[PDB]
Amino acid sequence: SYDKVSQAKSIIIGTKQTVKALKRGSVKEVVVAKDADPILTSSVVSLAEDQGISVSMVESMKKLGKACGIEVGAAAVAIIL
RNA sequence: GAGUAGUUCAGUGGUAGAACACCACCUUGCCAAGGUGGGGGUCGCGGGUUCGAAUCCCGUCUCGGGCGAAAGCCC
RNA sequence: GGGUGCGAUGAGAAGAAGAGUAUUAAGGAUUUACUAUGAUUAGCGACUCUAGGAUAGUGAAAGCUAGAGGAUAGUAACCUUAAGAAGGCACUUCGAGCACCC
Ligand SMILES: [Sr+2]
Ligand SMILES: [Sr+2]
Ligand SMILES: [Sr+2]
Ligand SMILES: [Sr+2]
Ligand SMILES: [Sr+2]
Ligand SMILES: [Sr+2]
Ligand SMILES: [Sr+2]
Ligand SMILES: [Sr+2]
Ligand SMILES: [Sr+2]
Ligand SMILES: [Sr+2]
Ligand SMILES: [Sr+2]
Ligand SMILES: [Sr+2]
Ligand SMILES: [Sr+2]
Ligand SMILES: [Sr+2]
Ligand SMILES: [Sr+2]
Ligand SMILES: [Sr+2]
Ligand SMILES: [Sr+2]
Ligand SMILES: [Sr+2]
Ligand SMILES: [Sr+2]
Ligand SMILES: [Sr+2]
Ligand SMILES: [Sr+2]
Ligand SMILES: [Sr+2]
Ligand SMILES: [Sr+2]
Ligand SMILES: [Sr+2]
Ligand SMILES: [Sr+2]
Ligand SMILES: [Sr+2]
Ligand SMILES: [Sr+2]
Ligand SMILES: [Sr+2]
Ligand SMILES: [Sr+2]
Ligand SMILES: [Sr+2]
Ligand SMILES: [Sr+2]
Ligand SMILES: [Sr+2]
Ligand SMILES: [Sr+2]
Ligand SMILES: [Sr+2]
Ligand SMILES: [Sr+2]
Ligand SMILES: [Sr+2]
């Protein structure tokens, strides 16, 4: 969802970033873009799978990272509550 | 008057020079830079002159320019 | 504040390599190449010798081409010592602006 990423306090941007923060385990939820290359998106849902955290799925990796504040759009972004 | 190496330029009768680019090694993470080495040229083309022609001479092609009624002519 | 180019497919910083390398110096060492020079006097023009070429004049010997052989330095290649770097991609954390222009 985009209201929830717009939302909140502590969020996480870029995919190397979600992945690194995934092995920390202090993320509450993680949201990802379907238009993205599945080469990377693979690598965020495998372990957001294994861990147990809810994964949701996005249309465009572009309005995602307008939601984030960035003026560029992101392929993976995590709300680390 | 312009014409010479990929390009930009020199070269004012003694076999064609520089930069830059291209090749090779340095140099296996991949480049760039660098430092060495090497390659490459009917001097637009054909004559003539000369021991020798990028050089001077005549013809010829292209291109700029100018004189001209043109044909032509000059740089 | 304006105009562009790029950025979570990673802006930008730092670390880490790079590397005790390239290299500048002080030596050591005396072979390989690279280049530079070859008394005077003729001569525009000469390290020596060989073969071809080709030769008008000057010359003891001439400009091309292909080889081979000589000393003087200057060089880069091997050693020692003291000094000795660096830009980008890629690595490694932090993670959003950086670059050109008025
Ligand atoms: Sr921006
Ligand atoms: Sr030309
Ligand atoms: Sr000229
Ligand atoms: Sr190479
Ligand atoms: Sr180079
Ligand atoms: Sr060279
Ligand atoms: Sr050369
Ligand atoms: Sr050369
Ligand atoms: Sr050719
Ligand atoms: Sr001829
Ligand atoms: Sr002749
Ligand atoms: Sr001729
Ligand atoms: Sr004319
Ligand atoms: Sr007229
Ligand atoms: Sr992109
Ligand atoms: Sr960077
Ligand atoms: Sr750095
Ligand atoms: Sr360093
Ligand atoms: Sr490194
Ligand atoms: Sr290395
Ligand atoms: Sr070290
Ligand atoms: Sr004298
Ligand atoms: Sr003399
Ligand atoms: Sr002399
Ligand atoms: Sr000789
Ligand atoms: Sr011989
Ligand atoms: Sr002979
Ligand atoms: Sr004679
Ligand atoms: Sr003679
Ligand atoms: Sr020779
Ligand atoms: Sr010497
Ligand atoms: Sr050394
Ligand atoms: Sr790589
Ligand atoms: Sr800078
Ligand atoms: Sr102004
Ligand atoms: Sr102004």
What domains can you pick out in chain A, each with its CATH number? 1-81 (3.30.1330.30)
Non-local (6+) Cβ contacts of A68 within 8 A are: A5, A11, A13, A74, A77
CA of A80 to the centre of ligand 13 (A): 81
Helix and strand tally (H, E) in chain A?
4, 4
| Upper half-sphere CA count for residue A41 (Cβ side, 13 Å) | 17
The residues with which A78 forms a beta bridge, in sequence order, are: A12, A30
Q: How far is the CA of A41 from the C1' of C99 (A)?
A: 31
Give the full edge-to-edge strand order of the sheet including A55-58: A11-13, A76-79, A29-33, A55-58
Technique used to solve these coordinates: X-ray
CA of A31 to the centre of ligand 3 (A): 71
Q: How far is the CA of A7 from the C1' of C25 (A)?
A: 65
CA of A68 to the centre of ligand 20 (A): 40
